[PDB]
Design a protein around this motif. Sequence first.
Motif, PDB file in Angstrom:
ATOM      1  N   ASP B   9     -30.387  28.288 -16.488  1.00 23.08           N
ATOM      2  CA  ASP B   9     -31.445  27.548 -17.160  1.00 23.08           C
ATOM      3  C   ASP B   9     -32.056  26.587 -16.167  1.00 23.08           C
ATOM      4  O   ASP B   9     -32.501  25.494 -16.520  1.00 23.08           O
ATOM      5  N   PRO B  93     -24.733  24.960 -14.821  1.00 23.93           N
ATOM      6  CA  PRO B  93     -23.996  26.191 -15.129  1.00 23.93           C
ATOM      7  C   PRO B  93     -24.661  27.444 -14.568  1.00 23.93           C
ATOM      8  O   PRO B  93     -25.862  27.644 -14.747  1.00 23.93           O
ATOM      9  N   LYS B 110      -6.586  34.541 -26.314  1.00 25.00           N
ATOM     10  CA  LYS B 110      -6.723  33.106 -26.093  1.00 25.00           C
ATOM     11  C   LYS B 110      -5.594  32.520 -25.246  1.00 25.00           C
ATOM     12  O   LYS B 110      -5.701  31.399 -24.750  1.00 25.00           O
ATOM     13  N   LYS B 131     -20.141  25.790 -14.120  1.00 22.32           N
ATOM     14  CA  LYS B 131     -20.600  24.784 -13.172  1.00 22.32           C
ATOM     15  C   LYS B 131     -19.743  24.796 -11.909  1.00 22.32           C
ATOM     16  O   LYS B 131     -18.536  24.561 -11.968  1.00 22.32           O
ATOM     17  N   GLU B 147      -6.623  26.873 -27.202  1.00 22.65           N
ATOM     18  CA  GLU B 147      -5.493  25.955 -27.421  1.00 22.65           C
ATOM     19  C   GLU B 147      -4.250  26.535 -26.745  1.00 22.65           C
ATOM     20  O   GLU B 147      -4.278  27.668 -26.258  1.00 22.65           O
ATOM     21  N   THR B 176     -16.254   5.248  -9.823  1.00 22.11           N
ATOM     22  CA  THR B 176     -17.348   4.318  -9.580  1.00 22.11           C
ATOM     23  C   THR B 176     -17.221   3.572  -8.256  1.00 22.11           C
ATOM     24  O   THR B 176     -16.150   3.067  -7.907  1.00 22.11           O
ATOM     25  N   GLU B 293     -25.167   1.427  -7.895  1.00 23.48           N
ATOM     26  CA  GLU B 293     -23.932   1.845  -8.547  1.00 23.48           C
ATOM     27  C   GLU B 293     -23.769   3.360  -8.493  1.00 23.48           C
ATOM     28  O   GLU B 293     -24.586   4.096  -9.044  1.00 23.48           O
ATOM     29  N   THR B 295     -21.692   6.132  -9.860  1.00 22.73           N
ATOM     30  CA  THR B 295     -20.683   6.452 -10.862  1.00 22.73           C
ATOM     31  C   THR B 295     -20.759   7.889 -11.376  1.00 22.73           C
ATOM     32  O   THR B 295     -21.841   8.422 -11.625  1.00 22.73           O
ATOM     33  N   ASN B 297     -18.984  10.184 -14.471  1.00 19.50           N
ATOM     34  CA  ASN B 297     -18.154  10.308 -15.659  1.00 19.50           C
ATOM     35  C   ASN B 297     -17.801  11.774 -15.875  1.00 19.50           C
ATOM     36  O   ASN B 297     -18.627  12.556 -16.348  1.00 19.50           O
TER      37      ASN B 297
END
Lengths: 336, 335
Positions: B9, B93, B110, B131, B147, B176, B293, B295, B297
């Motif tokens: 995309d 991705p 699974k 990704k 799971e 950070t 900064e 950073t 996440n």
Amino acid sequence: KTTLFCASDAKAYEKEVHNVWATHACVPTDPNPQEMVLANVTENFNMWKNDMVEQMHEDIISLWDESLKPCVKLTGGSAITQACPKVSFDPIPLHYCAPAGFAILKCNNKTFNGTGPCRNVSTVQCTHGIKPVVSTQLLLNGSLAEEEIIIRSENLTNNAKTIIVHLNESVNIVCTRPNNIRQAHCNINESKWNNTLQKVGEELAKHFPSKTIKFEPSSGGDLEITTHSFNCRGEFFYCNTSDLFNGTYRNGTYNHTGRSSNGTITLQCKIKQIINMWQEVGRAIYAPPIEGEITCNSNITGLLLLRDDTETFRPGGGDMRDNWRSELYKYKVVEI
Amino acid sequence: KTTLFCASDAKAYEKEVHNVWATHACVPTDPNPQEMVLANVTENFNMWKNDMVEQMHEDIISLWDESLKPCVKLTGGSAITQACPKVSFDPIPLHYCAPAGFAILKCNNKTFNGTGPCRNVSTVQCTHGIKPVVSTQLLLNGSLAEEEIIIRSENLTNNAKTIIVHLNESVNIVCTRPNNIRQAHCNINESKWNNTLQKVGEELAKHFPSKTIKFEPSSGGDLEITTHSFNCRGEFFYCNTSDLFNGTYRNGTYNHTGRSSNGTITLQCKIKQIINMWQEVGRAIYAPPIEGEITCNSNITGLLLLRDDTETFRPGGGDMRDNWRSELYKYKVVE
Ligand SMILES: CNCc1ccc2c(c1)[C@H](NC(=O)C(=O)Nc1ccc(Cl)c(F)c1)[C@@H](CNC(=N)N)C2
Ligand SMILES: CNCc1ccc2c(c1)[C@H](NC(=O)C(=O)Nc1ccc(Cl)c(F)c1)[C@@H](CNC(=N)N)C2
């Protein structure tokens, strides 16, 4: 009063409807928000009279309106039809932030019951991540109380007011429609549930002095409120909880009188096409369930109760504004 | 085998380098994903011997080569210099798709461990969105096991072989460099980490009868592998994990011997300029870190381990093809 704006980690490449919605409606969240701790100050909160709840309610209503398009929408005598495609459905955390010139005060008192004085206060720009989970009786995938279980009510002596139980330790629930195509079921560990209703039992015992405190199923009404109703992967699940809310707390001990097998409580669930809408007074009709295994693994983080010698409590719900209240109780929009 | 092609995309007016590369190297993703479920079809899988991983690796190498241009690149004793502008860097991705005549079989078990027999398989044209996160020790922003935590290895009794731990619930990590301009740090909630390491510890206890299962830091080597190394916004972060991988599992329970302060583990991090490349044997020198900064996440979705009465496990990594294998383990190209 102000007009809040939303923030999220929505992916533009994600075709899941919450991601689409948040992308077309929200702003990229800040990877490291920093709280301005206000000690010394003592201000009052009221989770039951909060505009944030109404704004969020509006946003979730619009979200469902643009995402979950029912085959039929019947209101009074007027019916509306349109294409009802199956979608990708899985709630993402929503942050609610105040625009420039406004601030969000946050209660840090950890036993705060939603109404009255709060003293450990602070200043944030945005709220914590909130998953807009629409459900009844049980509150799913929310935030836990960090100390003892907390009881919330607009008025506890008024049995007509909905009680919100904020748990300190989540209870895992696993609902599944295995690969009858409308027959599903939930699994819950009976030990965690017994412990939970023991703790909730005594926390209720404190507020109601010398009473036998019973937990019984919902009296009656629409299936949406008489059952644990919720949305799993775009499908509307209605799960019977007569074996879940079936117990007695007395003289400091609890007894689960609901049925269980090998330490597991199983709820019989039904995926329905005809639902009574929560957004407005009317009915919505959707397409038959998708094929394959339809499973949701969720965490029970809260309870919704209604009080009737003995004090009897039954599972409640129906007004999603309380569902938003269970997470928005510590916040308050303020002027600068 | 064949010559796979990518789909994304990716967005042509974005100056983020992954997008810049993907627009001219990939194909618009296809609105029509059509999965072919199959009954009565065993195929055997070996995630550790999959050429899709090699192709992916190679054009991620191309991607990095065109995107992150070092001021200097020293290889074989020869030094090559070029312009080193700071760029916009954030992985997108990538789908890997089979050309005409080929298809991609997809394991739906699974709890499949990557190697051996798989029954419930389907057929897709392209893989899921992956990704290309280059990292060591920790696998970031990947997929979770639907799971039950999964242990992966072509031979667990072979201590020389990298173990891939696929987690079912992600562990948030916040790195950070605040506004020493090379001093950074990471934050991780301790409860989720002791939880994770306990469950992982027991799923490890299954494969290893019952010895004491210890978690210790990387014994030694290059900083890229002795630390959690990763790239955040073009800057190369090297984060210490001596207080992350340091604990003991015994008695069916785990206790963290790593140090902490009020429920938060803080990794001491260092933004480096000189890097041992993962693309090839050589070193690359970049410009000083950008101002402001810095950073990231991220979500920990997996672990890279190496095994030495007691079984000792240490964080590993270095071979990014393992980082492609944790995501490509369930797919296989066939005609
Ligand atoms: C004691 N409280 C009674 C009360 C109070 C207020 C309201 C209700 C019930 C009605 N709620 C709902 O129909 C509703 O939540 N459905 C619903 C749908 C899907 C999912 Cl997944 C779900 F979990 C729930 C709603 C009014 N609508 C109609 N009367 N038709 C608002
Ligand atoms: C036990 N396995 C040991 C092993 C096995 C194979 C390989 C390595 C280590 C080497 N990996 C790396 O240098 C590497 O990943 N750096 C790196 C750069 C940037 C980021 Cl963000 C990062 F997270 C890591 C590489 C060889 N190259 C050199 N020795 N110069 C290939």
